[PDB]
Design an enzyme around this catalytic site. Sequence first.
Site, PDB file in Angstrom:
ATOM      1  N   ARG A   3       0.872  -1.174   0.000  1.00 47.44           N
ATOM      2  CA  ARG A   3       0.000   0.000   0.000  1.00 47.44           C
ATOM      3  C   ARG A   3       0.911   1.226   0.000  1.00 47.44           C
ATOM      4  O   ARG A   3       1.301   1.713   1.064  1.00 47.44           O
ATOM      5  CB  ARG A   3      -0.956  -0.025   1.198  1.00 47.44           C
ATOM      6  CG  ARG A   3      -2.180  -0.928   0.991  1.00 47.44           C
ATOM      7  CD  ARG A   3      -3.100  -0.295  -0.035  1.00 47.44           C
ATOM      8  NE  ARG A   3      -4.311  -1.049  -0.372  1.00 47.44           N
ATOM      9  CZ  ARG A   3      -4.391  -1.936  -1.357  1.00 47.44           C
ATOM     10  NH1 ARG A   3      -3.308  -2.226  -2.067  1.00 47.44           N
ATOM     11  NH2 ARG A   3      -5.545  -2.550  -1.626  1.00 47.44           N
ATOM     12  N   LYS A 109      -9.606  -0.988   9.271  1.00 52.07           N
ATOM     13  CA  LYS A 109      -8.912   0.057   8.541  1.00 52.07           C
ATOM     14  C   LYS A 109      -9.785   1.305   8.431  1.00 52.07           C
ATOM     15  O   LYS A 109     -11.013   1.262   8.539  1.00 52.07           O
ATOM     16  CB  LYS A 109      -8.429  -0.436   7.181  1.00 52.07           C
ATOM     17  CG  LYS A 109      -9.449  -0.695   6.182  1.00 52.07           C
ATOM     18  CD  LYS A 109      -8.799  -1.451   4.987  1.00 52.07           C
ATOM     19  CE  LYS A 109      -9.822  -2.385   4.405  1.00 52.07           C
ATOM     20  NZ  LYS A 109      -9.422  -3.010   3.102  1.00 52.07           N
ATOM     21  N   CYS A 334      -6.576 -10.848  -7.565  1.00 52.44           N
ATOM     22  CA  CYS A 334      -7.213 -10.751  -6.248  1.00 52.44           C
ATOM     23  C   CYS A 334      -7.654 -12.121  -5.754  1.00 52.44           C
ATOM     24  O   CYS A 334      -8.458 -12.770  -6.416  1.00 52.44           O
ATOM     25  CB  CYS A 334      -8.434  -9.842  -6.300  1.00 52.44           C
ATOM     26  SG  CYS A 334      -9.152  -9.626  -4.683  1.00 52.44           S
TER      27      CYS A 334
HETATM   28  C1  SRM Z   1      -6.826  -1.618  -5.901  1.00 50.71           C
HETATM   29  C2  SRM Z   1      -8.190  -1.400  -5.228  1.00 50.71           C
HETATM   30  C3  SRM Z   1      -9.306  -1.482  -6.274  1.00 50.71           C
HETATM   31  C4  SRM Z   1      -9.076  -0.697  -7.550  1.00 50.71           C
HETATM   32  O1  SRM Z   1      -9.321  -1.260  -8.641  1.00 50.71           O
HETATM   33  O2  SRM Z   1      -8.674   0.497  -7.597  1.00 50.71           O
HETATM   34  C5  SRM Z   1      -8.427  -2.397  -4.120  1.00 50.71           C
HETATM   35  C6  SRM Z   1      -7.994  -3.728  -4.148  1.00 50.71           C
HETATM   36  C7  SRM Z   1      -8.110  -4.633  -3.093  1.00 50.71           C
HETATM   37  N1  SRM Z   1      -8.735  -4.397  -1.896  1.00 50.71           N
HETATM   38 FE1  SRM Z   1      -9.765  -2.747  -1.418  1.00 50.71          FE
HETATM   39  N2  SRM Z   1      -9.142  -1.847  -3.096  1.00 50.71           N
HETATM   40  C8  SRM Z   1      -9.277  -0.530  -3.394  1.00 50.71           C
HETATM   41  C9  SRM Z   1     -10.184   0.348  -2.818  1.00 50.71           C
HETATM   42  C10 SRM Z   1     -11.126  -0.072  -1.865  1.00 50.71           C
HETATM   43  C11 SRM Z   1     -12.323   0.712  -1.501  1.00 50.71           C
HETATM   44  C12 SRM Z   1     -12.759   1.976  -2.169  1.00 50.71           C
HETATM   45  C13 SRM Z   1     -12.128   3.170  -1.526  1.00 50.71           C
HETATM   46  O3  SRM Z   1     -11.465   3.085  -0.459  1.00 50.71           O
HETATM   47  O4  SRM Z   1     -12.275   4.280  -2.066  1.00 50.71           O
HETATM   48  C14 SRM Z   1     -13.099  -0.125  -0.610  1.00 50.71           C
HETATM   49  C15 SRM Z   1     -14.537   0.087  -0.191  1.00 50.71           C
HETATM   50  C16 SRM Z   1     -14.666   1.252   0.802  1.00 50.71           C
HETATM   51  C17 SRM Z   1     -14.565   0.695   2.188  1.00 50.71           C
HETATM   52  O5  SRM Z   1     -13.455   0.381   2.661  1.00 50.71           O
HETATM   53  O6  SRM Z   1     -15.609   0.487   2.844  1.00 50.71           O
HETATM   54  C18 SRM Z   1     -12.216  -1.299  -0.412  1.00 50.71           C
HETATM   55  C19 SRM Z   1     -12.546  -2.318   0.480  1.00 50.71           C
HETATM   56  C20 SRM Z   1     -11.768  -3.450   0.722  1.00 50.71           C
HETATM   57  C21 SRM Z   1     -12.157  -4.443   1.753  1.00 50.71           C
HETATM   58  C22 SRM Z   1     -13.364  -4.519   2.642  1.00 50.71           C
HETATM   59  C23 SRM Z   1     -13.042  -3.742   3.917  1.00 50.71           C
HETATM   60  C24 SRM Z   1     -14.111  -3.870   4.965  1.00 50.71           C
HETATM   61  O7  SRM Z   1     -14.403  -2.883   5.669  1.00 50.71           O
HETATM   62  O8  SRM Z   1     -14.735  -4.936   5.131  1.00 50.71           O
HETATM   63  C25 SRM Z   1     -11.114  -5.454   1.637  1.00 50.71           C
HETATM   64  C26 SRM Z   1     -11.032  -6.767   2.400  1.00 50.71           C
HETATM   65  C27 SRM Z   1     -10.386  -6.636   3.756  1.00 50.71           C
HETATM   66  O9  SRM Z   1      -9.935  -5.576   4.216  1.00 50.71           O
HETATM   67  O10 SRM Z   1     -10.277  -7.657   4.466  1.00 50.71           O
HETATM   68  C28 SRM Z   1     -10.200  -4.985   0.583  1.00 50.71           C
HETATM   69  C29 SRM Z   1      -9.158  -5.753   0.104  1.00 50.71           C
HETATM   70  C30 SRM Z   1      -8.519  -5.510  -1.111  1.00 50.71           C
HETATM   71  C31 SRM Z   1      -7.423  -6.410  -1.674  1.00 50.71           C
HETATM   72  C32 SRM Z   1      -6.060  -6.093  -1.083  1.00 50.71           C
HETATM   73  C33 SRM Z   1      -7.766  -7.911  -1.501  1.00 50.71           C
HETATM   74  C34 SRM Z   1      -7.125  -8.625  -0.302  1.00 50.71           C
HETATM   75  O11 SRM Z   1      -7.460  -8.409   0.894  1.00 50.71           O
HETATM   76  O12 SRM Z   1      -6.239  -9.507  -0.496  1.00 50.71           O
HETATM   77  C35 SRM Z   1      -7.476  -5.988  -3.121  1.00 50.71           C
HETATM   78  C36 SRM Z   1      -6.274  -6.328  -3.985  1.00 50.71           C
HETATM   79  C37 SRM Z   1      -6.660  -6.668  -5.428  1.00 50.71           C
HETATM   80  C38 SRM Z   1      -5.439  -6.741  -6.310  1.00 50.71           C
HETATM   81  O13 SRM Z   1      -5.067  -7.820  -6.802  1.00 50.71           O
HETATM   82  O14 SRM Z   1      -4.780  -5.725  -6.583  1.00 50.71           O
HETATM   83  N3  SRM Z   1     -10.589  -3.767   0.088  1.00 50.71           N
HETATM   84  N4  SRM Z   1     -11.092  -1.254  -1.193  1.00 50.71           N
HETATM   85  C39 SRM Z   1      -8.273  -0.129  -4.416  1.00 50.71           C
HETATM   86  C40 SRM Z   1      -6.928   0.270  -3.840  1.00 50.71           C
HETATM   87  C41 SRM Z   1      -7.100   1.564  -3.034  1.00 50.71           C
HETATM   88  C42 SRM Z   1      -5.819   1.889  -2.304  1.00 50.71           C
HETATM   89  O15 SRM Z   1      -4.863   2.373  -2.950  1.00 50.71           O
HETATM   90  O16 SRM Z   1      -5.722   1.676  -1.068  1.00 50.71           O
HETATM   91  S1  SF4 Z   2     -12.667  -8.739  -6.044  1.00 48.56           S
HETATM   92 FE1  SF4 Z   2     -13.427  -7.996  -4.035  1.00 48.56          FE
HETATM   93  S2  SF4 Z   2     -11.593  -7.700  -2.766  1.00 48.56           S
HETATM   94 FE2  SF4 Z   2     -10.831  -8.093  -4.863  1.00 48.56          FE
HETATM   95  S3  SF4 Z   2     -10.523  -6.041  -5.647  1.00 48.56           S
HETATM   96 FE3  SF4 Z   2     -12.608  -6.551  -6.219  1.00 48.56          FE
HETATM   97  S4  SF4 Z   2     -13.996  -5.939  -4.543  1.00 48.56           S
HETATM   98 FE4  SF4 Z   2     -11.833  -5.817  -3.820  1.00 48.56          FE
END
Ligand code: SRM
Ligand code: SF4
Length: 464
Positions: A3, A109, A334
């Site tokens: 990150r 987070k 992912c």
């Molecule tokens: C790259 C990105 C999507 C994108 O296409 O742009 C992304 C990608 C992933 N997110 Fe995210 N999230 C991304 C924005 C978000 C957002 C939108 C936002 O923040 O604007 C959300 C929804 C808003 C929210 O948090 O409520 C989001 C909510 C999650 C969650 C669910 C968190 C929760 O509260 O339950 C996870 C799963 C977790 O944390 O366990 C997660 C987990 C992940 C993971 C790391 C999967 C994992 O746990 O192993 C993803 C990696 C995929 C990959 O192969 O690259 N990501 N993720 C975004 C990277 C943002 C950054 O630079 O940090």
């Molecule tokens: S498949 Fe689920 S965890 Fe993976 S990047 Fe998309 S919404 Fe986030």
Amino acid sequence: LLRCRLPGGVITTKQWQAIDKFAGENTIYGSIRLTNRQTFQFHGILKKNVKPVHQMLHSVGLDALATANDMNRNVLCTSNPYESQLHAEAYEWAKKISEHLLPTYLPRKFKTTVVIPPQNDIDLHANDMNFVAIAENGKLVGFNLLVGGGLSIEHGNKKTYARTASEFGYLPLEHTLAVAEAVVTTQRDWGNRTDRKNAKTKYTLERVGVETFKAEVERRAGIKFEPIRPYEFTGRGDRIGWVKGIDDNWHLTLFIENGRILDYPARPLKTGLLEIAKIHKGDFRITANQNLIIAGVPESEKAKIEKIAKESGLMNAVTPQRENSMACVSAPTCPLAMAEAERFLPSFIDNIDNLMAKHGVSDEHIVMRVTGCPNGCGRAMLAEVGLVGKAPGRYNLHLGGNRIGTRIPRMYKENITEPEILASLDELIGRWAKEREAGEGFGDFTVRAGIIRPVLDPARDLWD
Ligand code: SRM
Ligand code: SF4
Ligand SMILES: [K+]
């Protein structure tokens, strides 16, 4: 989990050249992936190159979040405000907040933004903590604070929900960091740490009450909130193409499909951006729509920059629909993916483009997003039309968000395939085209026409 910290998406050209080299030489996929939190990601870093990547970042003044115990994520800032003069100060505050939050272990987070009305590009209602800028005479005077947004849900679990953020009130600029710390520590102390699925601030606020949480933030910060100062949003999209900035400077926003920067046949997007980085006089800005701004171009340099961008495929024209569509990464990297998102979106929007043309609305758009599972990274739960992955080739279809992102869309159909989604949207876009009022968005139309009931109070009425 890598990150990379990059408050407000601002990256220098020297930093760009370093991450371009690392992406191309030291990763399986060879890409720079812009994320929708205004930063970038590498995919497929071998064992051999994990220490090299932290050393690469350090060599250009960048760092990554220690996600094992740091619950903060990248701090967002409106990338291209209509009042261009406001960007520098808002970005300085996004940086100050980001540095203030660097390592209090949090229960879950925690996500923060700085927003410049009338643009809600950073999608404030997806975030725990939001500072909405108020200015007088081109200078920031303070912020409206909104707390408790977050989009993650679990299929079939009515104890989970997406929630928008709640207004607390206005604070003068001098109290920003004391308020930020008070919100963070109140959530740290009151969050339901035991049940991870209930630990997010959105759940804390619903459990204790907005007024209770606000009162504790006031006590800890040593302030009293003032009444909210008026603000209104008009959209969430980027300003694709050239816009005038401050002085004699210009900003070129490049639409990049899925933020995926790679050289493709006849479209060397990655080499093009490297060539621009080598001549550009200013910085770049990664947007929350996974696009890229070549920021601060002097007028005399516009033609040189535009030449490279046009020849590399970075300025290939797309519809307003495609500019306002987004997907998360999903497969193949992912591990949590239930359905394709990034790899599905280009042909899905090809099909949507055909429907829009069929119904005579090719110049319009619908904020349309695909997320590969209900964690919700693609921000489908703030879309006018959202698809949430359920299984291979199958999505839940949500309708009735709005253009500005202040309403959660209710589920309309469950666990359906792309042909079924397109057949539904064909009928509904047709109705919208014929029945809409002047300037009425598709999401608002589906609510007004009774196609879907609105979500008015998501903790209580999101689930049917
Ligand atoms: C790259 C990105 C999507 C994108 O296409 O742009 C992304 C990608 C992933 N997110 Fe995210 N999230 C991304 C924005 C978000 C957002 C939108 C936002 O923040 O604007 C959300 C929804 C808003 C929210 O948090 O409520 C989001 C909510 C999650 C969650 C669910 C968190 C929760 O509260 O339950 C996870 C799963 C977790 O944390 O366990 C997660 C987990 C992940 C993971 C790391 C999967 C994992 O746990 O192993 C993803 C990696 C995929 C990959 O192969 O690259 N990501 N993720 C975004 C990277 C943002 C950054 O630079 O940090
Ligand atoms: S498949 Fe689920 S965890 Fe993976 S990047 Fe998309 S919404 Fe986030
Ligand atoms: K994009």
